[model samples]
Target: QLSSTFYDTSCPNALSTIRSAVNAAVAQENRMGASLLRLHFHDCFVQGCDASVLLNDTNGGEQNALPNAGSLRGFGVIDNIKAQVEALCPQTVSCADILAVAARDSVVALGGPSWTVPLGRRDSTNSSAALANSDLPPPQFNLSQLITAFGNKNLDPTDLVALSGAHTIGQAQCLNFRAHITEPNINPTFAASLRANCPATGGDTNLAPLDVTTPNTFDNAYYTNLLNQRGLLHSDQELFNNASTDSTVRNFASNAAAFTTAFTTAMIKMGNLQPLTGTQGQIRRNCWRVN
Candidate 1:
């Protein structure tokens, strides 16, 4: 099991260092907070938060995978934090732990609930591009697809409902949900505005905020957006379209306090997915490659 004090004596300033770097990054670009949090999700659901997602390979690695490729960002922020932490305490901290702590701080940096992040995770020696493709939930996923995706990680339906709230702060690329906007299931005016920037044939890189009400704040606005059919991705609207998760989505949308509490609990649970505790893996000196 991991502990909140995992680095208490080994690298006492590790959490503070990560928090400072994440705060600075988010302050400069608000969307970066969401990007960092999403990175942790992508990493954990794959090979169990081992920092395998950070690996880059010309031959083929997680970085080249479809789910990650151009979608993932905030690598520089993690690298910057790692450099500063290494400078202070050498190789005492693992890149995997850095990702977990930074993800918690990223949420708090943008007005989300704070939680104690259990650490002591270790980096993996190998990465799989195919695993990234198969593991990470796609933007086109429906409610059942999303639940099954989270369930594969031992997470339940409530976890799926709460964690999807992470959409409150991030933005989705046009290519990810161009059909959601143009097709049936979205607010027509919202789709019209989106179509202006994201054409049917091209402009795939164009960005749209997942939460139209407050794009930068980590609040319950995402659930509210879903209620109005303003959700930017098909997977997002799926939470409210059915009877299964509709009431849970309604509770989170109407109650920010409930959303914050549920979200914090869910994040900690997600972070605990198949972690490498004691001597299971190596503590890499660099985040992008195995040491």
Candidate 2:
């Protein structure tokens, strides 16, 4: 996966450019009112972070629609980056690598910590919009299932914790996080406050960044929030209670240094999936279509 000339160059400028493009895409989408990062998480969470979920349907044209793809609300962001990158550097980078870089960039754009991500991943010929549902974890997943799924992908409990840290940047629609804010497991004062602010049956869809005040900064705050029992998503907080994985969650929650260090390691591991490289892969001209 690391055979590209860019990696040999360590391409600091290219990396920074890619990061800027991705961050711009995320920020632009969010400002124009879209859940770009959430869409990214949705893609990875379901399908191992493959951007097949983001492939544009030529039939859809500038609409950025892919048949059967889930609510890819942030499609515009990556599309913008793709267009700009192609214009400046032609076919030098892969959309797959862009997806990884952009995800981390979006986190930084939103105030998350910056990590040095290695590049050279090849763009896929196509992505399976149809399989997205099966690939991603369900919103209702219990801890055991979540850990097992990630573990199947060679990710450990701590990796799951750090990946959930991605949640540290974006917002959750009421349809996803509302139940946790009601008569449930969290602290009473926080629950009551949430109930008052968010009514149960109002179609009251409000946006809440996982980190609230510090929406974009990547840090241990998300883990710390879990430690304090303020985790917004059921899945986010579940790790802290799952008897088997709770200690892993506690480790991330209590130790900023550990969380940062471990998160970088895990993100790199997550980014290095079954990528096609060397004699194994081809660089596609159009990211959506095969070579």
The TM-score leader among the candidates is: 1
Q: What local lDDT score does residue 102 receive in model 1, on the 0 to 100 scale?
A: 89
Off by over 4 Å in 1: 57-60
Which ten-residue region of model 2 has the weakest summed lDDT? Answer: 59-68
lDDT agreement of model 1 with the native: 0.88
Tens-digit per-residue lDDT, 57-150, candidate 2: 5412212333123334655566666666667666666666677777666666665556776667665545554455454665468788888878
**Lowest lDDT 10-mer window, candidate 1?**
55-64
1-291: candidate 1 lDDT, tens digit per residue: 898998999888888888889999999999999999998998898879898888774422888889998999998888889999999899889998999888899899999889989988988888878888998989888888888988898888988999989999989888998989776889899999889988887899999998989999989999999899998888888888865999999999889899899888889888988888788878878888777
TM-scores for all predictions = 0.97, 0.80
Candidate 1 versus the native: TM-score? 0.97
Prediction 2 global C-alpha lDDT: 0.63
